[PDB]
Write a structure and sequence with these properties.
This protein has one domain: Orthogonal Bundle (Catalytic domain of cyclic nucleotide phosphodiesterase 4b2b), CATH 1.10.1300. It is 65% helix and 0% strand. Helix 4 packs antiparallel against helix 5, helix 10 packs across helix 11 and helix 10 packs across helix 13. The longest helix has 24 residues. 34% of the residues are buried. Bound molecules: ligand K49, magnesium ion (MG) and zinc ion (ZN). Magnesium ion (MG) binds next to helix 8. It is classed as hydrolase/hydrolase inhibitor.
Length: 313
């Protein structure tokens, strides 16, 4: 109980910043995660023995894909930490526990292929889950690992708190389906601009947690340029493999996913920053003002891609 996790000084300072990069040392990530739970939630939230075996079983069920991997899970969880640490008073005790675990688990057992390709491939998971195919699967893996012996990190919760948190996690994980993001933001946009946003209305919280989950999931666009630049290489590696698999089904893939169309990437990034990222982090800064850095970082990276197009790199 009186065992605290501590980090080297540079990490200890930088980890409180939105643009922290978790680093290339795999074996440091679990201690980084547990140090954030401890500071975001409390030392007493989770039995440390049960928490560690949950973290290690989650790590095990992430695959060796270029992007949707163990480092993405921990990277996204840290972005949720930064948001919770800069909005101290706005969240209950169950939301702080549920959301840090939701993010670590959000891409559990990703194969490196979108819901589109599962549907076109006719993968069994597309028969079982007709919308948010991957995302409902991710939740199912999270509940599986929660029910392995020695893995029930929530064992001290009541029947009803247990059900409240798994419900937080389910909605939290479903929201990471970007197809749901566009509508969800446009409803928060309106609500905020008519001034009907009510953080005591449970259906309004759900929407806001949803807008956070999108923000945290895309947070590699909100890092320093050399980190965002090199993370783009990893995300496109996945897109291009899926493009190749699309061609194998006899379907010309969209340009994003065609590796013969890498010339279009800088322009493709612009549309993404304009169509998705800048709006996500705009509406989040309107709802949670202390999250403004994520917008600024996003804007800086948009400006770096314009400099790639203008042949300045
Ligand atoms: C609506 C639609 C087509 O589904 C969304 N459209 C695109 O995703 C889209 C379109 C064109 N070109 C790239 C696209 N997508 C991305 O670039 C991207 N996507 C994701 C999540 C799967 C989505 C996360 C990060 C991303 N970029 C990035 C990541 N890390 C560092 N730098 C940049
Ligand atoms: Mg996902
Ligand atoms: Zn993700």
């Amino acid at each position: 109980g009186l065992m605290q996790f501590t980090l080297p000084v540079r990490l200890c300072k930088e980890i409180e910043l939105f643009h922290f990069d978790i680093g290339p040392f795999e074996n440091m990530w679990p201690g980084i995660f547990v140090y954030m739970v401890h500071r975001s939630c409390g030392t007493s939230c989770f039995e440390l023995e049960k928490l560690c075996r949950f973290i290690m079983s989650v790590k095990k069920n992430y695959r060796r894909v270029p992007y949707h991997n163990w480092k993405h899970a921990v990277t996204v969880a840290h972005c949720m930490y930064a948001i919770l640490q800069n909005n101290h008073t706005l969240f209950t005790d169950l939301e702080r526990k549920g959301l840090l675990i939701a993010c670590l688990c959000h891409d559990l057992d990703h194969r490196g292929f979108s819901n589109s390709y599962l549907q076109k491939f006719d993968h069994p998971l597309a028969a079982l889950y007709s919308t948010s195919t991957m995302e409902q699967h991710h939740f199912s893996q999270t509940v599986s690992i929660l029910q392995l012996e020695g893995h029930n990190i929530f064992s001290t919760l009541s029947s009803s708190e247990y059900e409240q948190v798994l419900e937080i996690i389910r909605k939290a994980i479903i929201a990471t389906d970007l197809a749901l993001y566009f509508g969800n933001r446009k409803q928060l946009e309106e609500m905020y601009q008519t001034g009907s946003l009510n953080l005591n209305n449970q259906s309004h919280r759900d929407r806001v947690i949803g807008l956070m989950m999108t923000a945290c999931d895309l947070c590699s666009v909100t890092k320093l340029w050399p980190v965002t630049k090199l993370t783009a290489n990893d995300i496109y590696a996945e897109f291009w493999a899926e493009g190749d698999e699309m061609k194998k089904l006899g379907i010309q893939p969209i340009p994003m996913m065609d590796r013969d169309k890498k010339d279009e990437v800088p322009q493709g990034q612009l549309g993404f920053y304009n169509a998705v990222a800048i709006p996500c982090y705009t509406t989040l800064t309107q709802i949670l003002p202390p999250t403004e850095p994520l917008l600024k970082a996003c804007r800086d990276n948009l400006s770096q891609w314009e400099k790639v197009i203008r042949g300045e790199e």
